[PDB]
């Protein structure tokens, strides 16, 4: 059975980067000629493997992490990145085995009224571990007084929303990213 890689890339909706959905790729034959010879990507760069040698190579499972970041903050999608996205939304482990794919989706993710559906949980106490997911809306306490779930001075809301617009530059347009991980069933 062919791997269902169309379901994860041409999908109408991806989750926000703070709430990135992880998919395990079950037993299936992969077709990576669909993902290298086709070139819709603004960034297509692989870590520890190549863009063409991945065909005659295969792994015990794949994890696909589908999410939305901003185009400059795709530079924060690497091992050893420490940006607001890496520390607080999606941290690719150092020994990350896999390929990172990024494409401009300003046609379906940017609107003239401002798209505030895509959030990014911009405030957190301490950093994230390798592939930690934290969707908690627990009020961001910056001070000694307990926030008790109510906002105020030193009590800021831990989510901040994107403001995606068609009138921003390439560094500020909405970009879809899905990252394929490899771990040591799925061969092709």
């Amino acid at each position, epitope marked *: 059975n062919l791997c269902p890689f169309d379901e994860v890339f041409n999908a109408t909706k991806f989750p926000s980067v703070y709430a990135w959905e992880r998919k395990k790729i079950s037993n299936c034959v992969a077709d990576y000629s669909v993902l290298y010879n086709f070139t819709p990507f603004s960034a297509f760069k692989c870590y520890g493997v190549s863009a063409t040698k991945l065909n005659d190579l295969c792994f015990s499972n794949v994890y696909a992490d589908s999410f939305v970041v901003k185009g*400059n903050d795709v530079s924060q999608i690497a091992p050893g990145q*420490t*940006g*607001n996205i890496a*520390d*607080y939304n999606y941290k690719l482990p150092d020994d990350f085995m896999g390929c990172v794919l990024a494409w401009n989706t300003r046609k379906i993710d940017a609107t003239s009224t401002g798209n505030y559906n895509y959030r990014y949980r*911009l*405030f*957190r*106490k*301490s*950093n994230l571990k390798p592939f930690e997911r934290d969707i908690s809306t627990e009020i*961001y*306490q*910056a*001070g*000694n*007084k307990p926030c008790n779930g109510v906002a105020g*001075v*030193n009590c*800021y809301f831990p989510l*901040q929303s994107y403001s995606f617009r068609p*009138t*921003y*530059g*390439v*560094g*500020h347009q909405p970009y879809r990213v899905v990252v394929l991980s490899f771990e040591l069933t799925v061969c092709g």
Partner: antibody
Amino acid sequence: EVQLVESGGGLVQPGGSLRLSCAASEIIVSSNYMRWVRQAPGKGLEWVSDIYPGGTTYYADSVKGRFSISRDNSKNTMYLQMSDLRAEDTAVYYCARPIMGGRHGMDVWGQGTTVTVSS
Amino acid sequence: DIQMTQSPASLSASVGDRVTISCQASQDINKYLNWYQHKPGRAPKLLIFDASTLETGVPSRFSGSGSGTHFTLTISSLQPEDIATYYCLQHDHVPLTFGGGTKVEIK
């Protein structure tokens, strides 16, 4: 009230450790963006270093590898250790906070201190 | 790094004259650049955050607008208490870079 206090500034030799202390109240340093902004006499402002609330370190190229920004979560204070100080490191150093998340301005401020570097 | 140009570096006008200070960036910076009032012997004070919103406790004489690479500090009525230098700091992307300075004086 919202406040910061800069302290430990003055004269020190090149590569000396005055370790500018920035005591906080009503906000916790373990959970905040906090920045060193300096100004040489008769110059514009410049950036030095910043800490994300997770502890994440950054450095401007004029201060990279020579300075290190740090904090004491128990004492509620920020520290910038300075090493390989120079004649151009004579400036008025402020400890202050850009409101976390980029949208909002730089709410928390101290009055700043002058560090002078001379023979 | 990301360069900027403030224009002018200093200006002088009579009480109530409209003050306009520009800031040009090397690339699109959205809105996260802020404007700052530097008084001699004070901590520098904020003017506008989001490059379009007055901070609470900023005077209503200050206002800001723009997008992309050009920004404009607007003062609609100049006041005697405004004698200061002004800055356009960006925190838009690393490396973070401060503005060149613009001193206003009253004639």
